[PDB]
């Protein structure tokens, strides 16, 4: 996260670290959406151009964390993956269209003060909150500049008008993406950056006081550049796929 601040303790209890077994390293962020399902970006698991194709046994998820590097005894829980599910129409060749994946844990994680699932939006929550100018929040342990944080970082960023997202880039933007970030005029800054991908873009509903995951950190060209914006997977648009996988393969 660039130009963020340290997260508070328990601030993002759905935040998950995707952790490579060997060598031991952070791959990406992710989010807890039930006791056995974790949401992340497809490209964190599958990106052929860079020879990335993780299997279940390559990976761990670390839930309940605040510190990046420390083993947080009595606080974090580390879970093994039972099964990975990549959206069948994830477009790794062109533009990361449908950059979404689900990971089923071998065992349920126990909820605590530090471990708690985020809501997924309904059509109405999405219709209501996914509006230009409305701010969401992005968290992660990714790079601080286009070094690395001691603890989980947080930044709040406004959703940007779709023509502005499109005109900021040569990449073809689809309806399964939205962008967020301040404009050069606006005088505030901030962005996700490398290592933050797969983490959540959340919004707090003013209607029921609940946090909803509206986006997944997907891509940007650099980090915190003027005239550029971060791109997020549009979670509600892909929610049918999410339910389909969970209904079918959940217990």
């Amino acid at each position: 996260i660039v130009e963020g601040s340290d997260a508070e303790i328990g601030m993002s209890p759905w935040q998950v670290m995707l952790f490579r077994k060997s060598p031991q390293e952070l791959l990406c962020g992710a989010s807890l959406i039930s006791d056995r399902w974790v949401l992340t970006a497809a490209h964190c698991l599958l990106y052929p151009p860079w020879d990335k194709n993780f299997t279940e046994n390559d990976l761990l998820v670390r839930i309940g964390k605040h510190s990046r590097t420390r083993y947080e005894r009595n606080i974090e829980k580390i879970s093994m993956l039972e099964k990975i599910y990549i959206h069948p129409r994830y477009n790794w060749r062109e533009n990361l269209d449908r950059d979404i994946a689900l990971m089923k844990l071998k065992k349920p994680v126990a909820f605590s003060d530090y471990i708690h699932p985020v809501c997924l939006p309904d059509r109405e929550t999405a219709a209501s909150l996914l509006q230009a100018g409305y701010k969401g929040r992005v968290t992660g342990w990714g790079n601080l500049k286009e070094g690395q944080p001691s603890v989980l970082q947080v930044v709040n960023l406004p959703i940007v008008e779709r023509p502005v997202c499109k005109d900021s880039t040569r990449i073809r933007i689809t309806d399964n993406m939205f962008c967020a970030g301040y404009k050069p005029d606006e005088g505030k800054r901030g962005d996700a950056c490398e290592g933050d991908s797969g983490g959540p873009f959340v919004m707090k509903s003013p209607f029921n006081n609940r946090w909803y995951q509206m986006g997944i950190v997907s891509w940007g060209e650099g980090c915190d550049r003027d005239g550029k914006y971060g791109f997020y997977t549009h979670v509600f648009r892909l929610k049918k796929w999410i339910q389909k996988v969970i209904d079918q393969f959940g217990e």
Binding site: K21, S22, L26, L60, R62, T69, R70, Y71, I78
Partner: peptide, 10 residues
């Protein structure tokens, strides 16, 4: 760079 996690998890 990271603190070693318990062996059980590996």
């Amino acid at each position: 760079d990271f603190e070693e996690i318990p062996e059980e998890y590996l």
